[PDB]
Amino acid sequence: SGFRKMAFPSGKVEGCMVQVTCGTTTLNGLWLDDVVYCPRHVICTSEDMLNPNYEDLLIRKSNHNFLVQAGNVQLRVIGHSMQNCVLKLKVDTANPKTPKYKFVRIQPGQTFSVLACYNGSPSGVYQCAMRPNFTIKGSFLNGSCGSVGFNIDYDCVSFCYMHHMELPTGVHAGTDLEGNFYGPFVDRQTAQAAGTDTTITVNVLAWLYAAVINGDRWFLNRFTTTLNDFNLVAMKYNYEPLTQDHVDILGPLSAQTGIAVLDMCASLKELLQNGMNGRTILGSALLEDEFTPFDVVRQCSGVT
Amino acid sequence: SGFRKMAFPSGKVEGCMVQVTCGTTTLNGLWLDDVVYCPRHVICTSEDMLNPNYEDLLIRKSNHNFLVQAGNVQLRVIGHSMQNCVLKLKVDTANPKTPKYKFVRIQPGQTFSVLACYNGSPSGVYQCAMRPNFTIKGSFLNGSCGSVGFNIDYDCVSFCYMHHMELPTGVHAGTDLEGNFYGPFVDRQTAQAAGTDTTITVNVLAWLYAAVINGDRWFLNRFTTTLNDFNLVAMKYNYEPLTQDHVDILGPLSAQTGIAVLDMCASLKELLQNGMNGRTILGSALLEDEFTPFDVVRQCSGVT
Numbered sequence: 001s002g003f004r005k006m007a008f009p010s011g012k013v014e015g016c017m018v019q020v021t022c023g024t025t026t027l028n029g030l031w032l033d034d035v036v037y038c039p040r041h042v043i044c045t046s047e048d049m050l051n052p053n054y055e056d057l058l059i060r061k062s063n064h065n066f067l068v069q070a071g072n073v074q075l076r077v078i079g080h081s082m083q084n085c086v087l088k089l090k091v092d093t094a095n096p097k098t099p100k101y102k103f104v105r106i107q108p109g110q111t112f113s114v115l116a117c118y119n120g121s122p123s124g125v126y127q128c129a130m131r132p133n134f135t136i137k138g139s140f141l142n143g144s145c146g147s148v149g150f151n152i153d154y155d156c157v158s159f160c161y162m163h164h165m166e167l168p169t170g171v172h173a174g175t176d177l178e179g180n181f182y183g184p185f186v187d188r189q190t191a192q193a194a195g196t197d198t199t200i201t202v203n204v205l206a207w208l209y210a211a212v213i214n215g216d217r218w219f220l221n222r223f224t225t226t227l228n229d230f231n232l233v234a235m236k237y238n239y240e241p242l243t244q245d246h247v248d249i250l251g252p253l254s255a256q257t258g259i260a261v262l263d264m265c266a267s268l269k270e271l272l273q274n275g276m277n278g279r280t281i282l283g284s285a286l287l288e289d290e291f292t293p294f295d296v297v298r299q300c301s302g303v304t
Numbered sequence: 305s306g307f308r309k310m311a312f313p314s315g316k317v318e319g320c321m322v323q324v325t326c327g328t329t330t331l332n333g334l335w336l337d338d339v340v341y342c343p344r345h346v347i348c349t350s351e352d353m354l355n356p357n358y359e360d361l362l363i364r365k366s367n368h369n370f371l372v373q374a375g376n377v378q379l380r381v382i383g384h385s386m387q388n389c390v391l392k393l394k395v396d397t398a399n400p401k402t403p404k405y406k407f408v409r410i411q412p413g414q415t416f417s418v419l420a421c422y423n424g425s426p427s428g429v430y431q432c433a434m435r436p437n438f439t440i441k442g443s444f445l446n447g448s449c450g451s452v453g454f455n456i457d458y459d460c461v462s463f464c465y466m467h468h469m470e471l472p473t474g475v476h477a478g479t480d481l482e483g484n485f486y487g488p489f490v491d492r493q494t495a496q497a498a499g500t501d502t503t504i505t506v507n508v509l510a511w512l513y514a515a516v517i518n519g520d521r522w523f524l525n526r527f528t529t530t531l532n533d534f535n536l537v538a539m540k541y542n543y544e545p546l547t548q549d550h551v552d553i554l555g556p557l558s559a560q561t562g563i564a565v566l567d568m569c570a571s572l573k574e575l576l577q578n579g580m581n582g583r584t585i586l587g588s589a590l591l592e593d594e595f596t597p598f599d600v601v602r603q604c605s606g607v608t
């Protein structure tokens with residue numbers, strides 16, 4: 001029993017983190033096989049960052065200008081290329097700790113673990129979600145760029161995020177490992193505002209199921225609703241619309257608890273309209289939306 | 305910017321987790337040098353657990369009855385001893401992944417990371433605190449016993465907790481790595497109730513400093529207070545008394561923010577008396593108390 005915001009064990013990702021320096025800029029790289037992936041803004045002088053032309057800046061850079069350090073040992077850069085907003089630094093040594101891995105692009109609402117790094121060195125691990133506005137609410141200081149987000153399926157690390165920047169509002173933006181930003185963001189120091197950070201309804205419902213499984217039941221009520229009725233309430237409270245696809249994904253939690261998804265929708269509806277009245281659910285005073293249905297099943301069943 | 309509940313990177317601890325089986329009971333062990341540490345209740349039949357005499361049960365156990373598996377490889381047990389509520393299984397092979405380590409006994413209010421394991425395999429990492437009633441609020445299913453809590457100082461893992469049991473109230477109890485329970489708990493299936501789970505005041509104050517550093521400032525007010533005045537309010541709200549020692553520990557956060565500790569005490573006093581009024585601080589609707597002053601300085605300064 002108990003339900004915690006839980007990150008994947010980070011060891012397989014710790015073994016991939018390196019330091020990348022170009023000129024006076026130091027940040028993190030991800031070493032998989034004989035390629036080091038890092039944000040392309042490693043080539044920018046803070047002056048460059050206001051209106052950088054990355055193809056033009058990159059012309060002034062040679063392999064020997066990219067300093068790649070794995071622990072206290074230098075790696076030899078034998079090639080470099082730009083793919084979207086990341087650099088691929090080809091090195092002469094395959095990472096001997098390379099795990100089984102994939103590059104995936106996640107959808108809003110999907111959760112992942114972040115291994116926050118500085119100078120190629122792991123500092124902490126925490127759980128994030130891709131927000132509906134394609135930001136993440138992270139913990140990233142200068143030096144953390146190139147830190148990565150990931151999921152693990154048994155022994156295969158799916159890399160989904162690389163950290164690139166902080167918006168003036170202190171929320172975070174980055175890329176998949178193909179260098180494509182999530183959302184409309186660009187690696188330039190310019191006016192970039194986030195859209196509405198709506199609540200991930202399906203994740204809230206998952207977490208209410210987690211609460212019932214863990215003995216927190218006070219918010220269960222005598223009501224049901226319909227997707228259309230619920231969605232009117234969701235819209236009013238800046239919750240994501242619930243689709244039949246989300247109902248289908250919650251089916252295993254419905255089955256385990258014997259609470260119909262639309263009944264749990266009606267519980268959530270009353271919580272939105274009535275508030276918590278100073279009560280808590282799984283130690284929270286607000287409705288948690290950074291657990292996916294899959295996360296809840298994982299944690300409630302002890303998958304390794 | 306941003307402030308997340310952050311665990312230590314788990315890799316150094318992942319390399320220490322093994323499976324221990326005695327009879328039909330499987331749980332986790334910690335392999336450091338040539339010793340495997342595990343909960344002594346691994347020797348109990350669920351029947352035994354109601355009123356176990358561990359010295360008497362242990363007489364019926366030989367080295368060859370303790371099955372220790374590190375990944376898919378069996379370790380040879382060449383000795384066993386009981387220290388308080390843990391078994392030490394001497395094995396013929398030093399763990400080649402043994403990190404620098406210490407065994408520490410923590411005090412209430414201290415935070416640590418837990419690597420939740422099943423069958424010797426890491427499932428997740430999360431951040432906990434030793435509660436003032438010597439429970440922890442964990443996430444532990446059957447099979448998770450022997451999972452450990454830890455802090456890291458650069459390259460040295462301080463092991464502070466091993467998981468042993470869940471109370472009927474779904475909160476958790478365990479031992480230091482010398483096998484001494486935190487608090488009054490015993491490894492027996494009996495009536496064990498937790499005392500008052502008071503709020504860790506010094507940790508709340510640390511987190512309010514974290515909030516100011518991260519731009520969440522709405523709760524700062526025009527007031528100050530005294531330790532004695534504050535403590536009257538703390539007592540009423542089931543907060544731990546604040547001592548001068550806690551004020552001293554908050555000195556670096558005071559200095560960075562220019563907010564006197566007693567002023568931040570007066571802000572906290574108003575939050576207790578007035579509530580949050582539906583507002584949030586660092587994405588929380590309740591006052592977070594599982595960040596130590598040291599955790600806040602670590603995360604706000606990017607230590608690795």
Ligand SMILES: *CC(=O)N1CCN(S(=O)(=O)c2ccc(Cl)s2)CC1
Binds near residue numbers: 165
């Ligand atoms: C995004 C990131 O982590 N970066 C590494 C640090 N650099 S920088 O140009 O060296 C600095 C800019 C602000 C400070 Cl403080 S250091 C930016 C990219």
Ligand SMILES: *CC(=O)N1CCN(S(=O)(=O)c2ccc(Cl)s2)CC1
Binds near residue numbers: 329448450
């Ligand atoms: C505390 C722990 O993780 N343990 C391992 C599992 N055993 S057991 O006796 O095999 C079981 C008791 C309940 C279930 Cl379900 S399995 C208890 C100790």
